[PDB]
Amino acid sequence: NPPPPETSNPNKPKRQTNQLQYLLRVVLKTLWKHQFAWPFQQPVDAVKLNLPDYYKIIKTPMDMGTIKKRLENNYYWNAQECIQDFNTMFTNCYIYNKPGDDIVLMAEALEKLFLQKINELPTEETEIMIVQAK
Amino acid sequence: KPSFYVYSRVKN
Numbered sequence: 001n002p003p004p005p006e007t008s009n010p011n012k013p014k015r016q017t018n019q020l021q022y023l024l025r026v027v028l029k030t031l032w033k034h035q036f037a038w039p040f041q042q043p044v045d046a047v048k049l050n051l052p053d054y055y056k057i058i059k060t061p062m063d064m065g066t067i068k069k070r071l072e073n074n075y076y077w078n079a080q081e082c083i084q085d086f087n088t089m090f091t092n093c094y095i096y097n098k099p100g101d102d103i104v105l106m107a108e109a110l111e112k113l114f115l116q117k118i119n120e121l122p123t124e125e126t127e128i129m130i131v132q133a134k
Numbered sequence: 135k136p137s138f139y140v141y142s143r144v145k146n
Contacts, residue, residue, distance in 0.1 A: 039144055049142055103144040 001047045002055055005062065007069040012077075016129040018122050019079035024071040027086075027117040032064060034113060036106035040064050040089055058096055062089040078125065086114055 031037060041064045046054035055061065067085045069075075076082045093107040 039141070044145075049145055051145065097145070101144075101146065106144070 001043075001045060002061070004043045005060075005066050007066060007075055008073050009075065010134045012075070013133050014074040014129075014131040015077050015127070016074045017078060018126045018128060020071060020074075020076055020082060021128065022122060023079055023082050023118075024068075026120070027114060028064065028068055028071065030117055031110055031114055032068070034110060036109055037064065039103055039106065040093070040110065054096065058092045060088050060092070062086075062092060064089070074129065074131075079121070083118060087111075090114075 032041070043061060043063045043066065044051070044054055044058070046052065062085050067082065067089075070085070071082065090107050090111045093103060097104045
């Protein structure tokens, strides 16, 4: 099993804006308690699930746990890359699996809810906190 | 573990 994506970087700055705060407190909150949230709350354990070719095909793995801990530690710079992480999770599920599979339908429902919630995003980004690299 | 095959099902 490959290591999970980093959630903190000493060479990267730490930023918190109103949109990232919203993504953590509303979007990630409401997608975490969704009924179809469990297959995307952990990194894909390709060893354990008989999926040896998974990381040949998913070159950027992503899960709601990694995104959650990235938002908690203020690892992101702005909201766009957190939204990109969510979209990468959904697209990883899509590319890896088949359009009629149950997990693809679950990811599609999650993505629809996510797109609604991010449509409810604050339009103007306001910086709350910034810390330079250590 | 029974509650594991449920994981292995929705990721054929």
